[PDB]
Amino acid sequence: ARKGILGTKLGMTQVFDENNKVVPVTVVKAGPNVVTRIRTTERDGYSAVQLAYGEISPRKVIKPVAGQFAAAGVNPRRHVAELRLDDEAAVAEYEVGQELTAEIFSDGAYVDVTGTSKGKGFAGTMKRHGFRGQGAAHGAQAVHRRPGSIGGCATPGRVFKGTRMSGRMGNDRVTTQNLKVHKVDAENGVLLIKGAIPGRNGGLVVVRSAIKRG
Amino acid sequence: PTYTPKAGDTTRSWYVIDASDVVLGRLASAAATLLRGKHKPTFTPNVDGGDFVIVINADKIAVSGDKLTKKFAYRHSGYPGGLRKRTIGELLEKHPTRVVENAIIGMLPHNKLGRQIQKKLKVYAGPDHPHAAQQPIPFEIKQVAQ
């Protein structure tokens, strides 16, 4: 009941419509994934499916992983993620081994992707959280970009967890939703998503039919 | 002088209680008595020497008054406005074990020994349990006349 697939971000570009509007489409290469394993309420207590994507030259894989792949019978791959489905409905259409291909979507289909964001390092408040800093003139003694106050005075006398501060933003799993789909290429195994999806070109995405619209 | 239990002294037992419409307070006081060990003559507060307890039919616990729906369990994350509360009915229909647990945990010392006692408390929402290979002794809550 929830069609998902794994892919690799490449970049972005433009294409045009019949009404001659322009759509900022992001490309994804959902190379044909493989089903390594399965998850059921008898074995594990939930309903899911486990996918695989990429290529390893056979000596870079480890022996536990090679066992996880040769027990299911199939060959090793780089990235192994896991969609979480609902029940036998969404399980009865999957089989161990089978090759998924991008045609499972159709133009107009609304999807939600997930990806690991880009990093920005040790970030201040004015980049994490969008604070008005402070003035640049009129007497400022060295506070041109740092936050301000942080609490009271002898009540509480503490700092109220989730108080917002500097630190590493970026490098987190992120979900981008309700993206339309403009074209599917079967020859090259490519999706032309609309919008603007998370991550750095050359990483890992996971696209799914959207909840609100599927 | 007075007797103090050594290491090779303890003798354990696995008791099992029914919660078939028993009153929560009675049940919990009994379990606290057993776990802490106020029913054996070998009692010493520095030692944990009580008895394991297994509670069943815990989803059959029935209380008095309007406590099912006027009484409010509370929590607090630690964050601001992170006080969140729940009735007792919602909490039974979510997970019944927690009501009886927390009830008992408030009838114990909140010290190191109490934490080391809570290990000796097993609770199950149904009538069953996997601890049959200890042959658990049924306990029937009784009141001694005088």
Add this chain to the structure above:
Amino acid sequence: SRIGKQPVPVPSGVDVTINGQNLSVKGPKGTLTLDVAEPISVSRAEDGAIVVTRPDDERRSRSLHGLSRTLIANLVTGVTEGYTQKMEIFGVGYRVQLKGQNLEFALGYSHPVLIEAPEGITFAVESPTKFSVSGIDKQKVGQISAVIRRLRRPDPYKGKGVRYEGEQIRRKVGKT
């Protein structure tokens, strides 16, 4: 008291199963249920009636005795005959019709409104502005009838909405 002591008449094909306190009444219209509490005893008057009995004359008993009597009276009465409320749609260009079991209104909204028939009742329209609600369980009957009654927010100026057949509503004037 004066009601809770009366025995209750019971005509011919009226099978009353006293399974302890739990009571259940069979007649040509159906086999209805009823339950009562532990305190009050349900004796069958063996002249062809049923009689309630209570140990104490305390508050709870005085309250609950008469209730049980009136309930079982309604119960046997329904399974003999039934209940059928009548309702009437006053208005301008308002109207009611039926679609099989389920009923359809025109009440000035921009979409029409319908109702799902519950299990134990049926609707019965006699004219587009006039219908009935025929059932057995008086609780259910008046429930659904009042749910209908509350669709239109009341308007005592011109006399629109739904009316119980003998509803003598109040009225005022907005002259200007």
Add this chain to the structure above:
Amino acid sequence: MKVNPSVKPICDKCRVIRRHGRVMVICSDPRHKQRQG
């Protein structure tokens, strides 16, 4: 629903009752309807 700590049977038909731990004055005249609280 006039909410006041003082309610009374204004007219001859206002009946004073008690629902759910609140005193109420029911009457056919909705001007008269009221309760404690």
Add this chain to the structure above:
Amino acid sequence: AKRGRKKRDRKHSKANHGKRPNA
């Protein structure tokens, strides 16, 4: 307000016998 009242009302306990210091 609250604080003073709770003081002056804790005094009506049983082990104090109706009286406490600084009320």
Add this chain to the structure above:
RNA sequence: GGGGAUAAGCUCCGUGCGUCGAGAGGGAAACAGCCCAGAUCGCCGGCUAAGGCCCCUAAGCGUGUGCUAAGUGGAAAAGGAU
């Protein structure tokens, strides 16, 4: 008893009245002035006061007869109410 608003943990006087000051220990949830009681040192001895005996907390989910349905108990007024 005065001043004050017959308010103040306010201020000023009385009192073979008290305690604290200079006074521990027990009870009061913690709490100099409240209740009990006035510590020569020791004991792995006993009886009691105030207070308290469901578990935390040693001692009674004590006995008997009635009330309470409000979680009153475990803050509160003028007034209202079958």
Add this chain to the structure above:
RNA sequence: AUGGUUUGGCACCUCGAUGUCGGCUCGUCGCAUCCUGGGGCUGGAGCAGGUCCCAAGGGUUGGGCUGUUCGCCCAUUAAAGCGGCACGCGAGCUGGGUUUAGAACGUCGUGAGACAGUUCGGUCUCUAUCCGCCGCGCGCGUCAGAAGCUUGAGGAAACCUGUC
């Protein structure tokens, strides 16, 4: 009767230092609610309303004068909320005001000089030990040592509205 925010009463801790009005930045909390949402009564025809009950999730503008808080005005808005936290926050910023020495006007004083009258000017010190908080590591543990995939207790973020 409340609440304890207002002008005040007592003078109980602090004068071998508790840094004081307003503004900025940053919050978080209460509801005695400005809008949105549900609702009862009308001297409510309808559109707009008036008053009352429940309700805190979110949001709650930019500008002119004043050091000013408060306020008044302009132009919009769905709406332009009331208050607390050392009248929140100066080891976070300002320093216009007030409250050092200069100077002047009015009034008082014979005079030195003073005014909860005025007027122009006038140094804002500190390398964060501990708690706290945002992030990130080392170590050990979960009855053998390890590698992958993950369930979910429990916590957080988001939650606005308008015009045709």
Add this chain to the structure above:
RNA sequence: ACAGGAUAACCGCUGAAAGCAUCUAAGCGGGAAACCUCUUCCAAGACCAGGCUUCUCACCCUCUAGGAGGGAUAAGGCCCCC
């Protein structure tokens, strides 16, 4: 977001004590941006320290065999390197 459960004010159905009457005392219902689920994130240091899996899944010498100690290892990881 859509929808869903239990709800506040509120609207009620059936009905006594109290011959009628009454939303209630026994019961049954509808019902809000608030509440619990749903949405995105974290998370088994969640000490009830989880689960499904896979690989390795086997050596030696001492203290006088007391239980430890001390070596060389597999799977694997780390350091150095790009």
